[PDB]
C-alpha angles and dihedrals in degrees: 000000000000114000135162124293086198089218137114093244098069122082111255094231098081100121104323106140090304103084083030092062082046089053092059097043085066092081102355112113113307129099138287087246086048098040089050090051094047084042095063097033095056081048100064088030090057095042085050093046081045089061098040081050088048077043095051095047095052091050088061092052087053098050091043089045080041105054086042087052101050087036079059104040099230097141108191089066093047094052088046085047091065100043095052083048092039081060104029088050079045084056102041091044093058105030091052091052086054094052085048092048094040084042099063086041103053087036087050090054105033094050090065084032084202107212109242097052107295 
């Protein structure tokens, strides 16, 4: 399950309060119409955040591997090292920009928490 790097290289909205809040609005105090929707949309937004986290280790097994390739000379690996980063950081980047943005949407509805859906 997704838990801190404690580095400077993540992004900082891992489970903070924000999928907390989200925990709780599975059952808090919302509908049924409302509960079911959430329910699918966090669905979709943890599997996504999942993936950013599979993403992010990864990303540190590269750097280590890459700071020990190009601290061999091989060449070849360090240049397939920074593709696969290239990617992995092009991943985090925006990944990490759609959690923010879906972040302040689905923080903006849930905290009325309107009645009909939101």
């Amino acid at each position: 399950r997704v838990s801190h790097q404690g580095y400077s290289t993540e992004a900082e909205f891992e489970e903070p309060r924000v999928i907390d809040l989200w925990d709780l609005a599975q059952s808090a105090n919302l509908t049924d119409k409302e509960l079911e929707a959430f329910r699918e949309e966090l669905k979709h937004f943890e599997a996504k955040i999942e993936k950013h986290n599979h993403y992010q280790k990864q990303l540190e097994i590269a750097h280590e591997k890459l700071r020990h390739a190009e601290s061999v000379g091989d060449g070849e690996r360090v240049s397939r090292s920074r593709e696969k980063h290239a990617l992995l950081e092009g991943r985090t980047k925006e990944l990490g920009y759609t959690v923010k943005k879906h972040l302040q949407d689905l923080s903006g509805r849930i905290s009325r928490a309107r009645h009909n859906e939101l």
